[PDB]
Design a binder for this molecule. Structure first.
Ligand code: COB
Ligand code: COB
Lengths: 246, 246
């Protein structure tokens, strides 16, 4: 075995990602699977780190698109393997809610819009994923028609941030009332507080990652928790504008 | 059911911090130590989570200062217990660099300025911690006298942010060139890129936490990694301003 093939499973995952090696992903993911308490952990641990580095190497031009593209296929393959180990974890239960999630317009990144989808799914919620590059009006038309309890927007490229600010305003125009969930690698609480929220009277909660989304969605949907959380949050967003020199 | 004294060690930790109980902190921390790969994990895991809760309760007026102060005593007691286990963890052989770290003016929070210090130390770096509430002038004077290869500012309250921006400016005035590291609970990369960096020609890198500081200090000091890392960083902060409507 090549020396790399002897490193720590976690260090082997990262390598595979970077290099775009699809030959050992499954057997590596599985080994990593058995060590973690929860499948989601391998995804948000090793796998994500691996994608981070890929991100960087690409950013410093030490990596190119055709390569990040091979790295994505490996990530994709790794997630795919875990997916049933996730869905086996959801006994009984019906539905706690429903969310129309979608990668904003101009953006084709979805690897994450998906992990959050698969997670909320095995948590008993219905996720109508509109896909990548979906237009604001098609976001709302579906949110209405399906009667979603929330809407999640994913965004990874700079311009996306604006499409988010935009569907926030558009939602308000149609006088929506459902909590807006924002996320995606290039999304920060700062921007969500500073540039997104203000454009909408309903809750707009920036959530950092998939596993933490379940926590918000429950709150946003709990008759007890709702009003408090939404305030705590609104007040937290009030502070950050203060700091950024409003 | 019964008393806290039967819960998960991690769950017993979080409690002790909230209530300010110092009777089982060492005994408990030890149990937590034997489960983590590295001591730093408990400090950045349970302990931090407890202190987060504490902050919150204080913020919601559900907890008062004389209580957050006792919680501090416990957190402090837990770290202390851990320190030698950290020191007995690594010593390599000699100094890699030198850093003057200090908690900004009018700020007295320091439980983190220290953890980052104790981490950096066992990794073979010399740290001259100027303490809390240190004025810009004294930071620079020491930075020069001691010929530090970096400077670290810790800040946990809103006003501190401004002092950070201030010492960035002041460093530029004395035409410094060492990299400036920003950190602290109320420190964000957004504010770091939007309001701090611009004021200084040398590197201004915001590090999320102590453990991750090692990985930056190393780059900042590597002949190889240096110019790239510093460029990737700068460019990253360039984008964040752009999203922030700048
Ligand atoms: C698991 C997932 C891993 N993350 C990743 O999957 C993305 C990785 C990576 C390396 C980017 C680096 C990076 N910084 O991550 C880089 N890409 Co891409 C090179 N890219 C690709 C890949 C996408 C494939 C796919 N279908 O995903 C492509 C090769 C096609 C690709 C394409 C582009 N990419 C481009 C760019 C430059 C970038 N790419 C990035 C996003 C990045 C950040 C890299 C960089 N640094 O330069 C660039 C964006 C910079 C910017 N600020 O604009 C670009 C423009 C390149 C090009 N063609 O030249 C092009 C854009 C296409 C477009 N029209 O939009 C990839 C793979 C990447 O994490 P995540 O953060 O997305 O999800 C995470 C998760 C945790 O589970 O759930 C969360 N979440 C996310 N969505 C939601 C939520 C949470 C809630 C509550 C929601 C409601 C929604 C939370 O965010
Ligand atoms: C380990 C450490 C845990 N975090 C903690 O130790 C802080 C906990 C807590 C509960 C705060 C809540 C919170 N959100 O955390 C709250 N404090 Co205190 C109530 N407090 C105290 C405690 C501090 C004692 C001490 N010596 O530490 C005191 C009771 C004395 C205290 C005092 C104040 N506090 C006050 C306030 C309101 C707050 N306090 C906060 C900080 C906070 C955030 C909570 C809140 N929410 O209200 C308030 C500030 C909000 C704001 N935006 O201004 C205040 C004003 C209360 C008063 N007296 O009325 C007062 C300030 C007095 C002053 N002159 O500064 C405490 C304990 C807290 O994590 P950390 O993030 O600091 O370190 C972490 C670590 C990871 O390893 O390394 C990183 N790092 C940090 N520094 C650096 C780096 C990394 C690098 C690269 C660097 C160069 C530097 C990274 O940040």
């Amino acid at each position: 075995q090549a020396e790399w093939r002897s490193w720590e499973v976690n260090k082997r995952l990262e390598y595979s990602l970077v290099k775009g090696i699809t030959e050992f992903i499954e057997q590596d993911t599985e080994e990593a699977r058995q060590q973690a308490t929860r499948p989601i952990e391998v995804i948000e641990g090793p796998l994500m780190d691996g994608m981070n580095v890929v991100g960087d190497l690409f950013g410093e031009g030490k990596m190119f698109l055709p390569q990040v593209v091979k790295s994505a296929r490996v990530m994709k393959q790794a997630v795919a393997y875990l997916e049933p180990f996730i869905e086996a974890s959801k006994e009984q239960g019906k539905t706690n809610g429903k969310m129309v999630i979608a990668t904003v317009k101009g953006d084709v990144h979805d690897i994450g819009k998906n992990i959050v989808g698969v997670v909320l799914q095995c948590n008993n919620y219905e996720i109508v994923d509109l896909g990548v590059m979906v237009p604001a009006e098609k976001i709302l038309r579906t949110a209405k028609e399906v009667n979603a309890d929330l809407i999640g927007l994913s965004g990874l490229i700079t311009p996306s941030l604006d499409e988010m600010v935009n569907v926030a305003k558009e939602m308000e125009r149609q006088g929506f009332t459902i909590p807006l969930l924002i996320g995606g690698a290039t999304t920060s609480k700062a921007h969500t507080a500073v540039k997104i929220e203000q454009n909408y009277s309903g809750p707009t909660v920036y959530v950092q990652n998939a596993s933490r989304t379940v926590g918000v969605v429950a709150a946003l949907l709990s008759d007890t928790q709702r009003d408090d959380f939404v305030a705590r949050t609104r007040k937290e967003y009030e502070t950050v504008r203060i700091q950024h020199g409003r």
